[PDB]
Write a protein that binds this ligand. Structure first.
Ligand SMILES: Nc1ncnc2c1ncn2[C@@H]1O[C@H](COP(=O)(O)OP(=O)(O)OP(=O)(O)O)[C@@H](O)[C@H]1O
Lengths: 733, 295, 212
């Protein structure tokens, strides 16, 4: 009760800036924010902290050891003309983009940054402060609610910066600045209490580098291994329907680690920096109490995972102390900021290879089972139960019930009601009835519009299902008679990741470009496109996205819409990043009723094979079509594949007896070089002579364009093999 | 001591599931094959008193392309070699190339520890084949194969004797791993006498930063004493048993061993674990005899 | 006691056949399932699973004593030559096959041919219209030798029935030549011909006399 007031005092520290930018009034943002909050809320301790945010005010002191003195130190940590672009301060100086303070919604179209808005300032807006005052009528902030306000504070103020001044401090949004400044304030309260003294919370840091030099923070991180080995790998093909429930099983498992660890130590949601895909960055304090909590937590979290699961799932923590003087003031060397992450990521590669120890490894080698009955799904024999043709065990048994629970909007975390995911916790799927509702509920893609009295600590994750999984063979073929009864699998993954996070924002000696806030907004800006915008862009298509994370995705379905979605998703990423981050993937078709293990592994080998040239390459249906991706939508998909659809569609049956041979001539070029060129002049005359006389007017430029594309470049010869292959798969059978 | 060069062509070596396959295979596949075929010849009791003689051991399947290959050291090098410091993106993108590497050359066993990173040579590509059954509801299955190329061969190091050379003479015409009832295992044994003057650092006495291979397995009397301050990686190797008098073929217990190329600190002992789930007239033997390299 | 009988011969294809392979990546110049080839080179090869799945079916219909229904459970007198996952007397297969690789490339390029696989135009008649579904197949060329080696080994107990085992193997080789080996062989696509049928020993523990 006493320590929870500091968390809510740092969130609304700039609540008066929105009213000032909307209503014309010559008052400071720190003075009008305390008066507007006291009118509707009957508080006093949290109201004094708003007035005591800066250092040039001192309203007759009023308080010796008040908590309003540590809010100025933590404010400079998270800090350092509409809205500066995040990707603009990366790389070289290209174009100057600016955002627009709109309303963040899933159904709404994304507002890409461009150079056509108002470079002056904001103006007179009323679509932001109206929604805040409407839901402002809330009861006293206590322990019963935690994320009842953070889920809405970042769902509308995500396009509003904080402290519009100069250019260095402008790209940080107010929704992220107010959330990050609350994490550093909790570390100061834990550092001043674990030691011994308490009168320091006043005015004793006369030197500029006094408290900033002393290390009083901690950077925690983990690496949940066993994501692609448990979801992609499978035994039989009967687990295709429950594959979506398998992806959501490990998705909430990574979020449970962030919830069980922060609540046990005594923190909130502010001590979080993007949790998802088995990678996160937790912030703590450099105290002896916080170290003893993570050591006991990692020993108990891996205890129950050894009985039910095996050696596939493993979590290895990684701590690393640092100082606050590495992201502000002096020390502008890139090695100073990179040393913070090297103190924690180095042990990650050392702890994953040193998992179990004594009196643990010999437990699995004991031996006590003697039965021949397996689920034939994940290769595990532990507490089986009857089901259908086979006998499902217990690991993959809960996925059948959870597969039908996807339609439920809420996910109630229970103790032992279904399939347990933690030490003494569980997870089920039911809503619109509330049979019990223990604590900490989680939903999916819940932005604005739909908002009421729910109170749930949730996150953001993609979820979209078309029509089952094992039936896309019929959706790929039309009613007339075109297409095949197959399907393709694409794995869009982000290429470069070491830059724009470690040391890549440096371009001028003036700005440091090493503030943690500048590096934290990079993951938040891209998470909205790879985890939220995926569901909106995959609409009105015959596919279903699975595991929509910020790293690698898994889109399965008919290739009639996957090809039109992979090349289209990259176009929206270039405009969002101003063409500064490359992208690579790979589309590969497969057969029907096939094991998903090799079906998801063969499509992954093309990802590594598409990097032998440099970085901006692509791998098509096979490993031989190594292009640059950009040469597809601008040449192949532009004036090559489309040109055949209206300059050859008039010829059918008899006219479709020449493409199958021209493809073979394009391959036999090394051994048959000059001889193959002479044979090409004969096939160009057989099609023109064997047709109608009136139809010859349409076939007048395809002969010259096809011959020029054969003797010009070695890489251009492979482009004709892709255009002739996609045309046969279009109309056939 | 004595290497047995042998090349493969369109083979199969699964790891976990029948549909999946890897380029190499664990060391327990060779030991579990010569014992199974020893009873069909008429000398099963002769080889039982030979494997438990300390000096008798086997090695994993190491590539051979104009020179013997050795696995990469796990955990080596440490955080001291950066290899041409230019940018944080160029150093981080080249560190994963060594992680995906499988085997190193015989001449790069000393230069890799000083500071050198390069991409592994393309040995072979993973190709799959499809099969079905017409008179059974039209069902089908998918299996993977291993087609070597660019003169990709293997070799196994064992002890020279007047009994081991005759047992392996029939293995080249009987299959080895994978779908044996098709022809996915036939090879040719290339016998040799002089191995190589550089690959003679195989010792089992002194402990001077050794490296255990062929999936190590410590003894109960020496587990944590040699596990502290080391580099390893737990794997997985199991499957249904293959007997001729069970009418059920019980499942063998899991034996989570290590990987080929783990670096510890001291010298192990090596034992033979017996896998007996319920009851069997024989005894499922296992290799678990790791060697050591001086590095 | 323990011998290794190898049946080395050369399969001569007197008629171009068609066996559906995996996906379409090595031969995308067709409309149906192409012929499997080599993933490294570009030589049409045939897997060894088609030799066992076809010879066992055509042989278990004359040397049987009960109407079959499921594999590995019909005619015990010949089940020990292929495989059985039910009987305890035998499990392994004493007839190891091998993928027949096309070794005719040493003298094929000197004559100058088209390539390796041709395209044949086929269709159907619905007895109500003209041409329906203009599809096409991909057959194999004529005159192409292969390397077929059948491995046979005894296991001590194989004593008072070795002479009877050669009668079934020799009859099964000549029976495959009088039947198609491939897909859609009802019109005459398969029909192989085992040329130079000889048998030799490698380990050396059994004399050769029943050559032919
Ligand atoms: N959405 C994300 N937000 C923030 N960080 C991310 C995200 N996705 C991945 N990362 C970071 O990327 C790191 C893993 O990068 P990885 O090693 O996979 O790149 P890479 O495969 O080496 O790139 P390349 O293929 O270009 O060499 C993790 O440490 C994680 O912190």
């Amino acid at each position: 009760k006493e320590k929870i007031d500091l968390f809510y005092g740092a969130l609304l520290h700039d609540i008066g800036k929105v009213i000032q930018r909307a209503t014309g009034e010559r008052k400071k943002h720190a003075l009008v924010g305390a008066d507007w909050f006291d009118e509707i809320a009957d508080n006093q301790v949290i109201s004094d902290q708003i007035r005591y945010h800066m250092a040039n005010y001192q309203s007759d002191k009023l308080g010796n050891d008040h908590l309003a003195y540590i809010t100025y130190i933590a404010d400079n940590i998270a800090s350092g003309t509409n809205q500066a672009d995040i990707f603009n301060v990366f790389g070289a100086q290209t174009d100057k983009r600016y955002f627009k303070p709109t309303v963040l919604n899933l159904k709404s179209k994304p507002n890409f940054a461009s150079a056509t808005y108002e470079p002056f300032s904001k103006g007179d807006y009323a679509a932001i402060a109206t929604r805040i005052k409407n839901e402002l009528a809330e009861f006293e902030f206590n322990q019963a609610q935690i994320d009842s306000l953070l889920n809405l504070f970042e769902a509308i103020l995500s396009f509003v910066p904080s402290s519009t001044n100069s250019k260095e401090i402008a790209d940080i949004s107010l929704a992220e600045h107010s959330r990050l400044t609350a994490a550093f304030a909790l570390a100061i309260y834990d550092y001043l209490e674990d030691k011994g003294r308490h009168n320091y919370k006043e005015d004793l840091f006369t030197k500029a580098s006094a408290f900033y030099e002393e290390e009083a923070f901690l950077l925690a991180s983990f690496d949940l291994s066993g994501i692609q080995d448990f979801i992609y790998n499978i035994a039989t093909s009967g687990a295709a329907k429950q594959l979506k429930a398998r992806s959501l099983y490990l998705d909430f498992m990574s979020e449970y680690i962030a919830d069980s660890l922060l609540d046990k130590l005594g923190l909130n949601r502010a001590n979080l920096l993007y949790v998802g895909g088995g990678h996160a960055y937790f912030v703590l304090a450099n105290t002896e109490k916080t170290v003893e909590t993570l050591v006991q937590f990692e020993k108990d979290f891996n205890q129950f995972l050894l009985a039910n699961f095996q050696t596939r799932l493993y979590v290895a923590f990684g701590w690393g102390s640092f100082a606050a003087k590495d992201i502000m003031s002096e020390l502008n060397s890139p090695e100073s900021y990179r040393q913070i992450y090297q103190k924690a990521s180095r042990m990650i590669s050392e702890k994953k290879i040193s998992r179990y120890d004594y009196r643990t490894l010999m437990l699995l080698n004991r031996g006590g089972k003697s039965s021949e009955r397996e689920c034939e799904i994940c290769h595990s024999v532990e507490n089986l139960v009857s089901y259908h043709d086979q006998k499902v065990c217990d690991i993959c048994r809960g996925l059948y019930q959870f597969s039908k629970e996807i339609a439920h909007d809420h996910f109630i975390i229970t103790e032992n009601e279904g399939l347990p995911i933690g030490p003494n916790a569980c997870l089920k799927g039911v809503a619109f009835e509330k049979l019990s509702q223990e604590s900490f509920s989680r939903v999916y893609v819940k932005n604005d519009y739909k908002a009421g009295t729910i109170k749930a600590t949730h996150v953001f994750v993609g979820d979209y299902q078309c029509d089952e999984i094992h039936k896309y063979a019929a959706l790929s073929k039309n009613e007339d008679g075109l297409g095949i009864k197959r399907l393709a699998v694409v794995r869009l993954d982000v290429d470069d990741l070491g830059a724009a996070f470690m040391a890549g924002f440096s371009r001028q000696g003036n700005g440091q470009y090493s503030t943690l806030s500048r590096s934290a907004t990079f993951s938040r800006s891209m998470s909205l496109f790879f985890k939220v915008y995926i569901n909106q862009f995959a609409s009105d298509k015959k596919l279903s996205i699975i595991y929509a994370g910020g790293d690698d995705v898994f889109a399965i379905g008919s290739w009639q819409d996957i090809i039109a979605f992979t090349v289209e998703l990259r176009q929206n990423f270039i405009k969002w990043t101003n063409g500064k981050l490359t992208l690579s993937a790979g589309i590969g078709l497969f057969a029907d009723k096939t094991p998903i293990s090799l079906m998801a592994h063969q499509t992954g080998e093309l990802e590594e094979a598409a990097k032998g040239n440099e970085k901006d390459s692509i791998s098509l249906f096979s490993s031989d079509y190594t292009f640059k991706f950009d040469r597809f939508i601008t040449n192949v998909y532009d004036d090559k594949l489309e040109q055949i659809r209206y300059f050859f569609n008039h010829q059918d049956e008899r006219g479709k007896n020449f493409i199958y041979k021209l493809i073979e001539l394009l391959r036999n070029y090394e051994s048959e070089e000059k001889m193959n060129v002479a044979r090409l002049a004969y096939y160009l005359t057989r099609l023109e002579e064997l047709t109608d006389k009136d139809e010859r007017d349409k076939f007048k430029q395809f002969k010259k364009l096809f011959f020029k594309w054969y003797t010009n470049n070695e890489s251009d010869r492979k482009e004709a093999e892709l255009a002739l292959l996609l045309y046969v798969y279009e109309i056939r059978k | 001591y004595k290497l047995y060069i042998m090349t493969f062509q369109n083979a199969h070596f699964g790891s976990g599931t029948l549909d999946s396959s890897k380029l190499t295979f664990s060391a327990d596949r060779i030991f579990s094959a010569l014992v199974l075929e020893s009873l069909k010849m008429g000398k099963l009791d002769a080889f039982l008193a030979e494997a438990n003689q300390d000096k008798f051991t086997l090695t994993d399947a190491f590539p051979f392309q104009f020179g013997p290959f050795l696995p990469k050291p796990i955990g080596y090098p440490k955080h001291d070699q950066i290899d041409q410091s230019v940018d944080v993106k160029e150093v981080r993108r080249q560190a994963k190339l060594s992680k995906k590497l499988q085997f190193l050359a015989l001449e790069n066993v000393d230069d890799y520890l000083n500071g050198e990173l390069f991409e592994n040579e393309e040995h072979a590509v993973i190709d799959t084949v499809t099969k079905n059954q017409p008179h059974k509801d039209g069902n089908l299955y998918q299996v993977a194969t291993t087609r070597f190329s660019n003169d990709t061969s293997l070799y196994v190091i064992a002890n020279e004797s007047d009994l081991l050379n005759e047992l392996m003479s029939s293995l080249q015409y009987s299959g080895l791993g994978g779908k044996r009832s098709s022809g996915f295992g036939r090879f040719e044994l290339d016998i040799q006498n002089i191995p190589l003057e550089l690959s003679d650092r195989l010792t089992k006495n002194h402990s001077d930063k050794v490296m255990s291979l062929t999936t190590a397995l410590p003894v109960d009397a020496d587990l944590e004493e040699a596990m502290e301050d080391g580099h390893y990686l737990l794997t997985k190797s199991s499957g249904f048993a293959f007997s001729h008098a069970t009418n059920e073929n019980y499942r063998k217990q899991d034996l989570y061993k290590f990987a080929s190329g783990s670096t510890f600190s001291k010298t192990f002992e090596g034992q033979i674990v017996d896998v007996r789930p319920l009851d069997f007239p024989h005894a499922v033997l296992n290799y678990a005899k790791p060697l050591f390299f001086k590095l | 006691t323990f011998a290794k009988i190898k049946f080395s011969a050369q399969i001569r294809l007197e008629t171009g056949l068609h066996i559906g392979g995996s996906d379409a990546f090595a031969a995308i110049g067709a409309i149906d399932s192409p012929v499997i080839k080599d993933p490294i080179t570009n030589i049409p090869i045939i897997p060894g699973s088609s030799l066992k799945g076809k010879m066992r079916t055509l042989l278990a219909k004359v040397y049987n004593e009960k109407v079959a229904e499921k594999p590995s459970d019909d005619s015990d007198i010949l089940s020990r030559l292929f495989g059985n996952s039910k009987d305890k007397r035998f499990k392994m297969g004493r007839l190891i096959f091998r993928d027949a690789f096309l070794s005719n490339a040493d003298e094929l390029d000197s004559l100058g041919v088209r390539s390796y696989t041709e395209v044949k135009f086929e269709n159907t008649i619905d007895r109500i219209t003209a041409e329906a579904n203009p599809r096409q197949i991909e057959r194999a060329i004529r005159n192409s030798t292969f390397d077929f080696e059948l491995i046979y080994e005894i296991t001590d107990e194989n004593e008072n029935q070795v002479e009877e085992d050669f009668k079934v193997i020799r009859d099964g080789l000549k029976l495959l030549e009088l039947d198609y080996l491939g897909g859609s062989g009802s019109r005459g696509y398969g029909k192989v011909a085992f040329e130079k049928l000889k048998a030799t020993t490698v380990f050396g523990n059994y004399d050769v006399k029943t050559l032919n």
